[PDB]
Amino acid sequence: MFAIIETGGKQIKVEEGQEIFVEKLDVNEGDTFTFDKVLFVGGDSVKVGAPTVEGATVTATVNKQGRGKKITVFTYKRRKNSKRKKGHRQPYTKLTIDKI
Amino acid sequence: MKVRPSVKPICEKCKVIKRKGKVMVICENPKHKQRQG
Amino acid sequence: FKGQKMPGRMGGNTVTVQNLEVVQVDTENKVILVKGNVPGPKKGLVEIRTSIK
Amino acid sequence: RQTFMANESNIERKWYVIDAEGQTLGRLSSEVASILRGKNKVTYTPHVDTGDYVIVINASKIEFTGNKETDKVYYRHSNHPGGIKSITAGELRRTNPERLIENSIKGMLPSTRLGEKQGKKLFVYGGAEHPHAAQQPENYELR
Amino acid sequence: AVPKRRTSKTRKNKRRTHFKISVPGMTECPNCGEYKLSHRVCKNCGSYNG
RNA sequence: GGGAUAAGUGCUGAAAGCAUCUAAGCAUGAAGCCCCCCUCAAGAUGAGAUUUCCCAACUGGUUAUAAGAUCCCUCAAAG
RNA sequence: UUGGCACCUCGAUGUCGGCUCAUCGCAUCCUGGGGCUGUAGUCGGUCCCAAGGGUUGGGCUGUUCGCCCAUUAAAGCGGUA
RNA sequence: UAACUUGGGAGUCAGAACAUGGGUGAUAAGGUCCGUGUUCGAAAGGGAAACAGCCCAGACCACCAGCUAAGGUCCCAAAAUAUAUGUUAAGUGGAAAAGGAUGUGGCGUUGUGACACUGCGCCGAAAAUGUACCGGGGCUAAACAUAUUACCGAAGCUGUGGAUUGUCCUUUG
Numbered sequence: 237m238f239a240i241i242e243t244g245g246k247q248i249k250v251e252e253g254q255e256i257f258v259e260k261l262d263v264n265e266g267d268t269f270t271f272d273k274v275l276f277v278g279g280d281s282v283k284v285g286a287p288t289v290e291g292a293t294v295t296a297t298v299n300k301q302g303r304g305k306k307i308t309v310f311t312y313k314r315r316k317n318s319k320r321k322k323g324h325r326q327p328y329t330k331l332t333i334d335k336i
Numbered sequence: 337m338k339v340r341p342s343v344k345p346i347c348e349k350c351k352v353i354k355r356k357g358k359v360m361v362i363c364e365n366p367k368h369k370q371r372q373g
Numbered sequence: 374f375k376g377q378k379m380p381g382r383m384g385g386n387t388v389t390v391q392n393l394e395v396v397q398v399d400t401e402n403k404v405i406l407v408k409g410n411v412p413g414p415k416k417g418l419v420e421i422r423t424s425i426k
Numbered sequence: 427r428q429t430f431m432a433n434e435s436n437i438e439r440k441w442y443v444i445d446a447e448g449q450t451l452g453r454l455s456s457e458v459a460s461i462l463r464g465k466n467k468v469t470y471t472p473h474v475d476t477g478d479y480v481i482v483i484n485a486s487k488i489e490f491t492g493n494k495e496t497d498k499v500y501y502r503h504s505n506h507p508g509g510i511k512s513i514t515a516g517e518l519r520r521t522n523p524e525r526l527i528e529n530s531i532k533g534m535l536p537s538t539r540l541g542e543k544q545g546k547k548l549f550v551y552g553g554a555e556h557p558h559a560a561q562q563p564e565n566y567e568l569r
Numbered sequence: 570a571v572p573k574r575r576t577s578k579t580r581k582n583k584r585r586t587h588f589k590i591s592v593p594g595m596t597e598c599p600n601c602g603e604y605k606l607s608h609r610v611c612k613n614c615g616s617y618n619g
Numbered sequence: 620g621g622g623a624u625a626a627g628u629g630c631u632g633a634a635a636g637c638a639u640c641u642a643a644g645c646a647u648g649a650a651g652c653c654c655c656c657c658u659c660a661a662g663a664u665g666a667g668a669u670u671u672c673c674c675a676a677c678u679g680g681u682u683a684u685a686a687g688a689u690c691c692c693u694c695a696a697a698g
Numbered sequence: 699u700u701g702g703c704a705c706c707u708c709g710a711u712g713u714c715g716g717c718u719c720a721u722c723g724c725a726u727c728c729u730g731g732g733g734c735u736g737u738a739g740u741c742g743g744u745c746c747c748a749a750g751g752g753u754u755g756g757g758c759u760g761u762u763c764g765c766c767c768a769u770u771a772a773a774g775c776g777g778u779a
Numbered sequence: 780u781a782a783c784u785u786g787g788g789a790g791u792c793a794g795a796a797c798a799u800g801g802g803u804g805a806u807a808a809g810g811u812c813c814g815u816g817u818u819c820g821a822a823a824g825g826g827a828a829a830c831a832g833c834c835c836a837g838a839c840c841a842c843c844a845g846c847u848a849a850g851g852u853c854c855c856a857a858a859a860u861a862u863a864u865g866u867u868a869a870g871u872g873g874a875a876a877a878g879g880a881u882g883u884g885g886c887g888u889u890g891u892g893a894c895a896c897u898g899c900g901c902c903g904a905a906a907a908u909g910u911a912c913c914g915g916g917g918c919u920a921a922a923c924a925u926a927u928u929a930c931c932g933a934a935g936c937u938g939u940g941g942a943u944u945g946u947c948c949u950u951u952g
Contacts, residue, residue, distance in 0.1 A: 245938035246844045249428055257427075259842075259940050309840065316821075326841045327940070337627090337733035339746055341903040342879040352880065353639065357869085357901065359880045362639080367734065371746095373880045373902055374507040374721070374908080385697080389657065414696045425656065427843050452917035453860080456853045459916090463854090491919050492868065498917095501910040507721055510909060517623080517653080533916035534854040541855085546665075569860095594690045607691045 237281045239336050241294050242273030250333050251279075255299065260327045267298040269331065277336070296331040303327045343370035388412045392424055432471040440478045442566040443556065447487035449568070451530050457568050458482065459534035462544045475540055479547045481563055482531075485523040486552040490515060500529070524550040 238251040244259035263269055271294040276285035284292075303325035312319035343361045345352060350363030352373075359373025389412075396406040411419050442461065446454060464470065464477020490498070495516035503510045518526050527550050535541045549558065556563075598605045601613040610617050 242844090244842085244844090244940070246842070304841085307841080311823090311838095313821090313823085318821095322840065322942095324840055324941080337746070339733090340879095343902095344879065351638075354880085354882080354901090355640070357882095359902065361880095369733080376506055378719080382698090387658070391656085416696060429843055450918080452853080452921085455917070456860080456921090459854050492870075494870080494919095497870075499910080503909050505909095507908070512652085512910085521653095530916065531854095535916095536855060537915095591690085596691090609691095 237336060238277075238279045239274050239292065239294060240276040240285075241271040242275060242288075243271060247275065250294065250336075252333055252336060254333050255330055256296070256333060257328050257330050259329070260301070261298070261329050263298045263301075263329075265298060265301055268334070269296050269298055270294065271296065292336065294333060295335045296333045298329065299332050300330045301327075302330075338367075338370045339372050340370065341372055343373045391426065430469065432469045432474050432476050434474075436469060437474065437476050439476075441481065441558070441561045441563040442478060443481040443483060443563040444566045444568070445484050446482050446527060446550075447484040449488055450491060451488050451526070454482075454488070454568065455527070455530040455534060458531050458548070461566075462531070462535060462547055463541075464544075473540070475544050475547075477544055477547065479549070479561070480566075481549045481551075481556050481558055482527055483551050483554055483556055485527045485550050486519070488519070488523070488527065495519070523552040 238249055240247050241250050242248075246259075248256060248258070250256055261269060272288075274289050274292050274294055275287065277289050277292045278284055304327070306323050306325045309322040309324055310320070343352070343359055345361060345363075346368045347363070347365060350361050350365070350368045353360050353362055355371075358371050361368065361370040363369055390409065393411070394408040396408055398405050405421065407421070413419055444454070444458065458480055460466065461480055462477050464475060466478075467476060469476055496514060498515045500513050500515070500518060501510060502512075513521075515526065528548060531548055532545045535545050549556065593606050595604050596607045597603065598611045598613070600616055600618065601611045603611075603613050605611045605613075608619075
């Protein structure tokens, strides 16, 4: 009994009791959150998929809301005195999938 | 035996043939045989 | 290029001579007399056989 | 995220045996190289050989097309000055067919450290008898 | 000639792989009680007795 | 001395009722090709093979020992 | 080969000819195999396949090339800074 | 949705290839000189094997999402051993002429012979370290000609989140 949820312009194969990591959602720490973009459900249970299954949904607890590891964005043009350094901590939110 | 890039019948009993993908000229007068068309 | 002739260690190869003849097979002294002079030093092992030609 | 990668304990490997009678050399070699690298199976990952072991038999019976027996000179250089060697496919088919098919297939696998592992999973015999009875080889037909 | 490129301190140690010196090949003297070097006179006390 | 061949010479034969060494098919034909002759070669990691020898005492493994090879010494046909 | 251009090298890419050592191409000088000859034979001429091996020693000139001498089966033509 | 003016500040005055109109040269040159354009200069990404200038396309940053561009789908190497109809036997494809020639297909005109145009092929076709003019294997279809689909394919576009500049106030958002 898994599913495929469309969350942030990306699909995710999700089973229960699993912790998942998604782009930033507006909710705060420790909250429920219902996924509606579910395109395909069921493993050993059933195999039903439409553009969106439209009968099934998912519910997750908003476990945490943070920022990934700072990747430094460095790059340069050789012999032409041009270089550029940036930083980036892409923000994420981690969720526990409570029910399907 | 003439080996030149233009074989054409000289006297009216010389006949053009092919052999091994080469254009030959068989002829009774033995001067008149040619190949490499 | 490989095969360029350069200084290095010389001699010691397994060389073969051919078409020698047998002047005399001295039995009871157990020697053979061959026409010529064969590879190897004195006391050097030599294997004699019949010509391949 | 989630993308299954093949490990040493995930992988399986199977034994196939393909008649090389009546097949064009390259039309068969492509199929065989596909099998060797291992992308007939869904657990394909690049950094490991999830492919199979293959036993090509009847290598003294492959067919060329057109004037390729007398043409199609195989060359090889000995790295000595001026020493280049040659052999036509007709003379390599009667003298050593098990090198004909091997060279065809191994030119279609990558030249890497893992491509040589896969390169030495090919077992080519000129004949109908292969000594790998103890391996449970399977039939295989050209897809 | 002169070196075209300075030698790493890896290639150096590889080349000095064989810069060992073996032990001498010694034994113990049955008379002196101590280590001598084989086929030599005993350093400590006297005799060879060979 | 062979086996396959280049130029070459053909033999049979239609395409083309004939002619035709060629398309099917079959012969012959070079100091040249591959052999044969000489050597090196299993690090040929595709690591081949034949013969002979050796093989026990304790705690999952280890030990010294065996057959064997050396350290050390006298040397040269080797360096 | 004689040139044309001026693209690399002027904080350096050393000249011609010999000596040592060669290696490659074939547009073959000899030796091997053929066709045609205005090829009687010997001896040739001109094409065709062929690169396995061989291809001299002196005089004169810095000399290369070049002429001469005495032979040879032959005294090849080129590339590799 | 730029333009001009008046001010402060500069840099540039060695240009290159590609297409094209010319001069010069020899209807030589990656030659040289000018008109027009593009790119490089100062431009990363994909294709051309490798390759500033060739074809596609302009990188704010993250993403293990989707759609296309030149170019491609037998294997190396992602996606058609797709589809319908024909041509080519040379490995042509995958270096080159004058000229030669019962190669072969189309089409038309002609008295089984002869002809004009044509499609694709053959010969002409010889160089030096090593095959060595498809990138390699290999190919008789995995080559050509015309038409249908599918798909792969970029840092292009889209989706999501984020960061700085702006302009409009729906509601200073």
